[PDB]
Structure 1
Amino acid sequence: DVIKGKDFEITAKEVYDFTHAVGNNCEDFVSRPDRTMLAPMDFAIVVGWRAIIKAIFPNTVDGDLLKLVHLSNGYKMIPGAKPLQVGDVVSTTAVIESVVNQPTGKIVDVVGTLSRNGKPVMEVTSSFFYRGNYTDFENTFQKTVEPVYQMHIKTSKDIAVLRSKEWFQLDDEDFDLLNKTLTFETETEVTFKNANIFSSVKCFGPIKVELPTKETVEIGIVDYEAGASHGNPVVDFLKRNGSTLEQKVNLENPIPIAVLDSYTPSTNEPYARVSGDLNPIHVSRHFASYANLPGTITHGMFSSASVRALIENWAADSVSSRVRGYTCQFVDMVLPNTALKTSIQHVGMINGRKLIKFETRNEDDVVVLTGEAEIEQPVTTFVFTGQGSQEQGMGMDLYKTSKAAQDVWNRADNHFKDTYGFSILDIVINNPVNLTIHFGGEKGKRIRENYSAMIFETIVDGKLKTEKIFKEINEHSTSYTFRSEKGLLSATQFTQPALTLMEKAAFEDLKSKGLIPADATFAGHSLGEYAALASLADVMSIESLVEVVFYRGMTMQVAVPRDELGRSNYGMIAINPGRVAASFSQEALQYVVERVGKRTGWLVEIVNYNVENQQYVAAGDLRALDTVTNVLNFIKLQKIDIIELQKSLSLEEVEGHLFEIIDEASKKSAVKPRPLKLERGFACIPLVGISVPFHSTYLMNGVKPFKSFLKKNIIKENVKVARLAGKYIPNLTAKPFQVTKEYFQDVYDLTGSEPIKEIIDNWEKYEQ
């Protein structure tokens, strides 16, 4: 039966006392004003003690409590809950896990459950050892709570195996188990007969299947019940055939973090006071000598806390929140005034949580303390790079080594061959100059039809036009050829997928090595945006991803008429506001650029708001770009401080003057050779090979084909809300991804979408 302790008020007093007892000097437990005081996870034992220690007391568990040995104590913060604040009221709930008779004595396992406002907060796991010889097999049992096991059903044999198992009781017998994901929430009662042979094995718990809608439903019961058995059949089945939710992944080489000297105090009195562990063998010498001990020993739970404080210091960088799960094995006992030598090792990861393993020795170089510590990564944001930076064989060093990388590239490459009839690898590795796609054979035909169906929409003097890309390609075409001057790798329908692949590949390696936090936020610059979504929320398959990115590159290439050769009348330039003048700011470029495009009539706009007063990018008309670089060349050579005579001297005579300054650079750059070579000057640097004003208003037209293509390659049942909500930051709406009215509204205010507005008009689809 369950033990409940008194609800415990945490006070600023009791934490302050406990920290100085154990010697934890972390900032989080000090009364700085505004930023409330935290309580350590060590402090749970002070709360837990009254309930936990009660478990070993009953008549049916009969032991010489003088010869009790504290074996192991483990903390485990449940996922999501915050650690103990100073103001918290904590309910304790102690369940005994295992009473077991071994030859050397009886082991008692206790599981505390701290409760804040009715929510579970952390599990306190203690193991206790009565020395002696006990034939107490009647009052001996094992009620454990087994962790959750998940099975991916792939084959027609996986289903047939489960149907052979008596304990696989479904609600619906006919239910389709193909391509589904079962999750098994399992506990198990065991009673004993001997030290080896169990008298009654009982294993039960619900069977939930992962639905496409992110939440699971229970449609299955485990119902195993046996007599004289040897082992738990159900669990051993789930070990081999299924897997845990969380996979531990060891590093190639363990890292010594630090080797530290924590010392035991001269007396055990001050810990006994705050803890409630008044055990006489720690304090009174005559009691100690009766238990055959080498004198008054230092508390087990003191040593645990003391080492944990250094783990907290040297792995969590003086932060209490990051440490998630701490266990502590007690090998041998510890005298006062002893010099403990604890070595700390970072050994592994588990889905973005560091595995710390420590080992504490005394002067005599004898093992005293071992244990494990699950510690969080710091608060993490993944940001994915955009266009520009692309070399021959980028990330191919990573392709050779990482299994996860090999998966990404090849599966994409297999699709490029089977749908668009080229090797994206060949492109990256070799960077050829001419590539010829051939449409011969049944397989060739399907690739040609895939080139045909590509469309875009440009405004041609009157109205919209559903003109297709690749005018040459018809039902009678055999070859199409890609032509560049340097190499295909820098022609942006190749740049873009390669860049996207490299980043995704890199990510999946980190995911395989478990270096990714669950609560990571993510965004991406122009292109990286797409990779980010495929990376952290599995929005598209690798298959469906590179399709879009390829199509993006294609629609970007044609949206501008470039009649002459590979030369349009559009481009873009990067600006450094700092270089021209020390006062020239954002609000200075927003005037100049808006005025040059209102005056000349030529379209020029800011497209990249990258770094404040250091890196902006303006795209548009090459005539209008030669003006802006010359106007910015003018304000850098005059150096006539703008804040001095902006509104302070000449009120809106800037507009008259800026025009006069425009119309001697505007009427000078309009008489140039038609596809004008752009040069660099003092602030404005041209982006080489960039010919398209992407992120401008000019290409608002060619969206309907791009949208309709996204609709084919982004299916509804591939979008996890939870793995996007307040983690994903788009480029359009630089606010956390939320599914709320004010978000939908903020989009349409920039967008003008009819599918968005028809949702705002009846936001009352709260009722299914």
Structure 2
Amino acid sequence: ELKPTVILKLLKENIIQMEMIENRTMDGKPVSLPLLYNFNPDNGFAPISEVMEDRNQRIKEMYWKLWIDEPFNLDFDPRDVIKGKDFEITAKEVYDFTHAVGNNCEDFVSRPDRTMLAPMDFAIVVGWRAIIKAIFPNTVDGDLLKLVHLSNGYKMIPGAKPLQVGDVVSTTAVIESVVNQPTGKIVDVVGTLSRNGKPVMEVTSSFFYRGNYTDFENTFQKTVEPVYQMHIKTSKDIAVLRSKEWFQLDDEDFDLLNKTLTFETETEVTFKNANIFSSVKCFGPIKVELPTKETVEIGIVDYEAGASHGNPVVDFLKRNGSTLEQKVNLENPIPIAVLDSYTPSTNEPYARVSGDLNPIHVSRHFASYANLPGTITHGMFSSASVRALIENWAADSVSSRVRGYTCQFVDMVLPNTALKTSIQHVGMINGRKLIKFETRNEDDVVVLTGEAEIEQPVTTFVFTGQGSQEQGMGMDLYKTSKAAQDVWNRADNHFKDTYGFSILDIVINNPVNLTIHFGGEKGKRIRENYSAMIFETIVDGKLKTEKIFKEINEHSTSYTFRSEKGLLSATQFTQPALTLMEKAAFEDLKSKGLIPADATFAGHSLGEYAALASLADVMSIESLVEVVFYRGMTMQVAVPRDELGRSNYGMIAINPGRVAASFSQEALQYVVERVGKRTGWLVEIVNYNVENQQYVAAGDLRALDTVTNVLNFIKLQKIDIIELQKSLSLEEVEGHLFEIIDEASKKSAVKPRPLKLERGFACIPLVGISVPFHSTYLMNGVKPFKSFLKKNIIKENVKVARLAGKYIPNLTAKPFQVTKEYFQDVYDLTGSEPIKEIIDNWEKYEQ
């Protein structure tokens, strides 16, 4: 429809009013902008002099009736927090926005029996009225037409959920820093969103009033600097710390040694000019890391300065302390995709949905009034048109993965232009992915730079136990990685200072004979460490503690370790190579920052020690290597061996999907329990690996040649146990099973004790092992490993937060919690006195 856009007329005799009608409004009523001019007839060359006096507040009033539903007011100080009215999220507010911007996210669609999520660029829609209200006060004076929105970032805080439908999200804001550039004035304002009282995300907003501004009295810089952590390992930097006047302590004699100080530093900075600061004031708490991992206030940063050219406090800590979180690049940037997006014919679909009715987007007369080449598409729209393709690929079409998002507005765009965004992955940040985008139009010109801090998907870590033993495992990683170097060296140093051999030597060349010489003053500490290791076995039903190395005393000069082929075959040298090369692998991925902060981890048999030392670091790598060595020797002498070193125990790798089709995992446990009760020889399912396809049974060498022969008969007879016990007769299969077990166990007693264990049709004997571990065979040998574990794992280094919900044992196989019901479950599975000591005194610990 053909609406009036301009009313040119005389207002008074000498005053022209050119008035510009804008129609698209909140209340349908078009708003007038009366641009006044003086017509001076005495100055014939340029008679039309614009009324510059009383101009910014008239532009303000016009914009107020397009952005601010409140009463027109400018006598509120910029420093003081600005509140937003409580804005809620509907399902309509998602459908209009997502269709307008083409955000084709199914998490933003209504799917049954799940909450509808909202776009992270809907948060500007939520909090435009609070964010933009920052620039309005008369001390933040400027021309809103020439005002260029420079940048606009989001930071979804760690631990809070992203926005959903219904969520009534209050808005607030405050002006971080207003600074008179030579080219204009950059106001940085942060406008957070608060749901259920708690903040959700911070929404950074850098605006630019282009011009020349002397109003330095109104400039300030209230920057809330990032926290800075620094380890106090020396008494040199302490003397440096005590010399720092800003650094004041509530306890002047507080032990700063070997602690960890975090600094929640905020610096206000007023100005004389753009360079010199009239007042610099760095303050905040100083938080020492208590062994419990919590952070307690021990002092105050309190810096006070006049004519300063920089923040000494930040200058000091940024060199001498860390940011709490250091990013790492990629070796090469990943060329994700060079995608194409199109700005829409009209800027009305976004202008309406957001409530940003800046006429330079819509009114061709306002657009050309500001010298723009036409009705400029919203920058924030282009922001949402590229973030949808950043939400499309890096986050695998997921919405909760998006944490950060910053988008600098560089080039002005007309409607109907063909963009070209080359998406470039640059590095990690503590698991999360850094994606750098660079939008160029049809003519190859930079329009939108910025990035997105996107969470990697939920990750689970499955640490291998034993298995394949190999010469030179992780030597390539050791040659390359800096973390792999550090961990192996540390391990090796601990080994040679504790156990008088090099772990590197063993994995590299695999010597047949290694001689530990107790030669000197150092040698004696190694001998005491070898004669300090104990185990407990049952002969004639007595709990006696036997000695590991029965041929080591205090007259023993040198011990020899032997192997038939190579020492990497013997469990006590095999397992420290595996757990070290895993820990090396993990400390290479952590160095590359590929580990999510909330990733679960469940270790297999031996891997659980690598996982715990990896994800928790509750014991040092020096503690881990000697823990797996002590267990590897305990897992050696636990069984009685002949003079040759062979024992009458061993493993099988049961495949129950090879004996019978209807052979359930209730049938293999029933057959193994019935065999153990009939033959009287120990056999137990010790590894629940894969359902009805992969198990491991641990027990006597005879006891694993009867269950194999029970499953060789059942396959060749085609008789099931679960059908006949139910549908034929009650407890008849119990009697009918003991005669098959009696037949299988009669032939398995004739052969001598070092018996060659057969590979069945549904059983594979796991060679290189002759110890029943993960069974009841080691009930006796548990007790001395407690006395071992207490010295090694220190209670101060155990972080409950790092273990909670992530550490999944192989005992209980649940999310680790500090609850009565979990300790009850661990007692029920493993009868222990110190578990029932807590359970009974549970309410005494509660208070």
Cα shift readout 1:262-300 (whole Å, capped 9, x = no counterpart): 101000011110111100010010111110110111101
Equivalent residue number for residue 127 of structure 1: 206
Cα shift readout 1:387-406 (whole Å, capped 9, x = no counterpart): 11221111111111000001
Equivalent residue number for residue 513 of structure 2: 434
Cα shift readout 1:415-472 (whole Å, capped 9, x = no counterpart): 1111111111111111111111111211111111111111111111041111101111
Return the alpha-carbon distance in structure 2 between the equivalents of residues 294 and 192 of structure 1.
37
Query: Which residue among 758, 779, 790 is the counterpart of 1:679?
Result: 758
Cα shift readout 1:308-364 (whole Å, capped 9, x = no counterpart): 000000110000000110000111111101111111011100100000000000001
- Worse overlay, 473-482 or 741-750: 473-482
Return the alpha-carbon distance in structure 2 between the equivalents of residues 405 and 336 of structure 1.
54
Return the alpha-carbon distance in structure 2 between the equivalents of residues 644 and 601 of structure 1.
26
On the 8 A contact 1:349/1:514 being kept in 2, the answer is yes
On the 8 A contact 2:139/2:218 being kept in 1, the answer is yes
On the 8 A contact 2:576/2:628 being kept in 1, the answer is yes
Q: Secondary structure at the match of 1:669?
A: coil
On the 8 A contact 2:460/2:601 being kept in 1, the answer is yes
Q: Secondary structure at the match of 2:538?
A: coil
- Worse overlay, 148-157 or 474-483: 474-483
> How far apart are residue 638 of structure 1 and its match?
1.9
Q: Any unmatched runs of 5+ in structure 1?
A: none
Return the alpha-carbon distance in structure 1 between the equivalents of residues 232 and 541 of structure 2.
56
Q: Secondary structure at the match of 1:235?
A: helix
> How far apart are residue 765 of structure 1 and its match?
3.0
Return the alpha-carbon distance in structure 1 between the equivalents of residues 308 and 718 of structure 2.
91
Return the alpha-carbon distance in structure 2 between the equivalents of residues 58 and 418 of structure 1.
70
Cα shift readout 1:470-529 (whole Å, capped 9, x = no counterpart): 111111111211111121101101111111101001000011111101001111010001
1:501 aligned to 2:580?
Answer: yes
Sort the Cα spacing of 1:643 and 1:763 in 2 relative to 1 into closer, same or farther, 3 A.
closer
> How far apart are residue 51 of structure 1 and its match?
0.6
> How far apart are residue 642 of structure 1 and its match?
5.0
On the 8 A contact 2:667/2:722 being kept in 1, the answer is no
Query: Which residue among 402, 423, 427 is the counterpart of 1:348?
Result: 427
Return the alpha-carbon distance in structure 1 between the equivalents of residues 413 and 391 of structure 2.
22
Query: Which residue among 641, 661, 669 is the counterpart of 2:740?
Result: 661
Equivalent residue number for residue 705 of structure 1: 784
> How far apart are residue 144 of structure 1 and its match?
1.0
Return the alpha-carbon distance in structure 2 between the equivalents of residues 312 and 642 of structure 1.
54
> How far apart are residue 653 of structure 1 and its match?
2.5
Cα shift readout 1:628-672 (whole Å, capped 9, x = no counterpart): 111111112223355554532354322222222111221111111
On the 8 A contact 2:512/2:563 being kept in 1, the answer is yes
Q: RMSD in angstroms over aligned alpha carbons?
A: 1.1
Return the alpha-carbon distance in structure 1 between the equivalents of residues 680 and 723 of structure 2.
30
> How far apart are residue 202 of structure 1 and its match?
1.0
Equivalent residue number for residue 376 of structure 2: 297
Equivalent residue number for residue 723 of structure 1: 802
Return the alpha-carbon distance in structure 1 between the equivalents of residues 608 and 140 of structure 2.
61
1:272 aligned to 2:341?
Answer: no
Q: Secondary structure at the match of 1:456?
A: strand
Equivalent residue number for residue 562 of structure 2: 483
Q: Which 4+ residue blocks in structure 1 deviate beyond 4 angstroms?
A: 641-644
Return the alpha-carbon distance in structure 2 between the equivalents of residues 180 and 631 of structure 1.
62
Equivalent residue number for residue 182 of structure 1: 261
On the 8 A contact 2:173/2:192 being kept in 1, the answer is yes
Return the alpha-carbon distance in structure 1 between the equivalents of residues 258 and 228 of structure 2.
17
Sort the Cα spacing of 1:451 and 1:221 in 2 relative to 1 into closer, same or farther, 3 A.
same
Q: Secondary structure at the match of 1:458?
A: strand
Cα shift readout 1:706-741 (whole Å, capped 9, x = no counterpart): 111001101111100000011100111111100000
On the 8 A contact 2:422/2:439 being kept in 1, the answer is yes
Return the alpha-carbon distance in structure 2 between the equivalents of residues 678 and 137 of structure 1.
89
Return the alpha-carbon distance in structure 2 between the equivalents of residues 519 and 343 of structure 1.
31
Cα shift readout 1:169-202 (whole Å, capped 9, x = no counterpart): 0001111100010000011111110121111111
> How far apart are residue 98 of structure 1 and its match?
1.4
On the 8 A contact 1:81/1:121 being kept in 2, the answer is yes
Cα shift readout 1:204-234 (whole Å, capped 9, x = no counterpart): 1111111101211111111111111111111
Return the alpha-carbon distance in structure 2 between the equivalents of residues 134 and 418 of structure 1.
69
- Worse overlay, 635-644 or 2-11: 635-644
Query: Which residue among 320, 328, 341 is the counterpart of 2:407?
Result: 328
On the 8 A contact 1:316/1:375 being kept in 2, the answer is yes
Q: Secondary structure at the match of 1:15?
A: helix
Return the alpha-carbon distance in structure 1 between the equivalents of residues 112 and 741 of structure 2.
57
Q: How many residues are paired up? A: 768
TM-score, normalised by the number of residues in structure 2: 0.90
TM-score, normalised by the number of residues in structure 1: 0.99
Return the alpha-carbon distance in structure 2 between the equivalents of residues 292 and 760 of structure 1.
77
Equivalent residue number for residue 97 of structure 1: 176
Cα shift readout 1:595-623 (whole Å, capped 9, x = no counterpart): 11100111111111110011011111111
Structure with greater Cα Rg: 2
Cα shift readout 1:648-701 (whole Å, capped 9, x = no counterpart): 235432222222211122111111112211121211101111100001112101
Sort the Cα spacing of 1:600 and 1:643 in 2 relative to 1 into closer, same or farther, 3 A.
closer
Query: Which residue among 423, 432, 436 is the counterpart of 1:357?
Result: 436
- Worse overlay, 271-280 or 431-440: 431-440
Q: Secondary structure at the match of 2:705?
A: helix
On the 8 A contact 1:583/1:642 being kept in 2, the answer is no
On the 8 A contact 2:721/2:733 being kept in 1, the answer is no
Q: Any unmatched runs of 5+ in structure 2?
A: 1-79
Q: Secondary structure at the match of 2:844?
A: coil
